[PDB]
C-alpha cells in the first residue's frame, strides 16, 4: 500500500496473507468463513507452493494471535486468463478451520443487486495489505489500509493501456500518490455500510503503483457472488 495508514488493532481482521516457501508474503486474501479464503487467480502462479497466515499485523513481531493454515483445495475461475487478468478470482479451502478471535474475522458477502445499488455507488472503498510502500520499494512489515475512491468505468478505460473488462473496476486516484501495490494483489477491497464491511473487490493489477494517470484495477466481486457461493458449497 502506497500512502494510507497502518491498520489499527482489530480494524482489518479479514486480511489474509499468502506465504511462499520461506514464510514471505507475496499476495493477500480475504477471510470469507472458517474454511474459505478469497484471493486472485493470478496469485496462484506467483509461488510453486504456499500457505495462508491470519491474525498478523506485524510480520517481524510474534503477538501470539497469528495462525498458519494449509490449503486443501484451490478453486480457480475456469475463465481466468493471464493475458488480460480477466476473471481474476480464486477461492481456497483450508485443511483446518480458522478460529475467529481478535484480528481474525470474515468479511461479509453482500447480495448482488443491493451491492450494485448501494455499495458500488459509495464514494470509497478500502484496500489493505502488506505490499510495497512505493512502486520500486519494499514490502511493509506492518499491515496498511487505504481509502480508495471508486473511479468511473469510462475514465478507467481511457486511462488504461490494457483492456478493462466488465469483470474489473478502477479505484484510487489520478495523481494523488496513494494506491495498492505489488504484494497487495489478491487482498481485500471492502466497502463500509453502517459499520459493516462487505467484500467488493480483489486487488488485481496496476500499471506500476500510484502512477499519474493510472488507477488500481480490482476484480468486480459482484460479478462473482454466485460463483463464490457455488465454490464454497
Amino acid at each position: 500500500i502506497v500512502g494510507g495508514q497502518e491498520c489499527k488493532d482489530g480494524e482489518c481482521p479479514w486480511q489474509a496473507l499468502l506465504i511462499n516457501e520461506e514464510n514471505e508474503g507475496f499476495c493477500g486474501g480475504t477471510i470469507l468463513s472458517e474454511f474459505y479464503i478469497l484471493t486472485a487467480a493470478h496469485c496462484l502462479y506467483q509461488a510453486k507452493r504456499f500457505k495462508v497466515r491470519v491474525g498478523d499485523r506485524n510480520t517481524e513481531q510474534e503477538e501470539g494471535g497469528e495462525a498458519v493454515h494449509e490449503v486443501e483445495v484451490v478453486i480457480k475461475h475456469n475463465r481466468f486468463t493471464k493475458e488480460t487478468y480477466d476473471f481474476d478470482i480464486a477461492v481456497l479451502r483450508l485443511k483446518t478451520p480458522i478460529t475467529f478471535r481478535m484480528n481474525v474475522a470474515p468479511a461479509c458477502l453482500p447480495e448482488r443487486d443491493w451491492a450494485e445499488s448501494t455499495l458500488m455507488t459509495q464514494k470509497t472503498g478500502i484496500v489493505s495489505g502488506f505490499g510495497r510502500t512505493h512502486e520500486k520499494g519494499e514490502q511493509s512489515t506492518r499491515l496498511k489500509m487505504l481509502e480508495v475512491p471508486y473511479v468511473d468505468r469510462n475514465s478507467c478505460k481511457l486511462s488504461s493501456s490494457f483492456i478493462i473488462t466488465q469483470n474489473m473496476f478502477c479505484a484510487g486516484y489520478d495523481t494523488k500518490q496513494e494506491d495498492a501495490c505489488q504484494g497487495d494483489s489478491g487482498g481485500p477491497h471492502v466497502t463500509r455500510f453502517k459499520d459493516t464491511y462487505f467484500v467488493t473487490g480483489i486487488v488485481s493489477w496496476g500499471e506500476g503503483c500510484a502512477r499519474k494517470g493510472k488507477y488500481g484495477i480490482y476484480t468486480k466481486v459482484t460479478a462473482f457472488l454466485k460463483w463464490i457461493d457455488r465454490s464454497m458449497k
Partner: protein
C-alpha cells in the same frame, strides 16, 4: 417506501416490493423483530471489526 432513502431504514440489505421494503441480513445475523436491524448470532460476525476484546 424506498430503498433509495436511508436504505429503507434497513441495517444491511434492502429490496423494494410493490408498496413496501423488505430488509435482510448476511449469514451470521438475524433480522430483528422490528424488521430493520441485523443482530449478530455470534461473537465474530462477518464484516465487524474486532474491537471488543473478549
Amino acid at each position: 417506501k424506498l430503498c433509495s432513502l436511508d436504505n429503507g431504514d434497513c441495517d444491511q440489505f434492502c429490496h423494494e416490493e410493490q408498496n413496501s421494503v423488505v430488509c435482510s441480513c448476511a449469514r451470521g445475523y438475524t433480522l430483528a423483530d422490528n424488521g430493520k436491524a441485523c443482530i449478530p448470532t455470534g461473537p465474530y460476525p462477518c464484516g465487524k471489526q474486532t474491537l471488543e476484546r473478549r
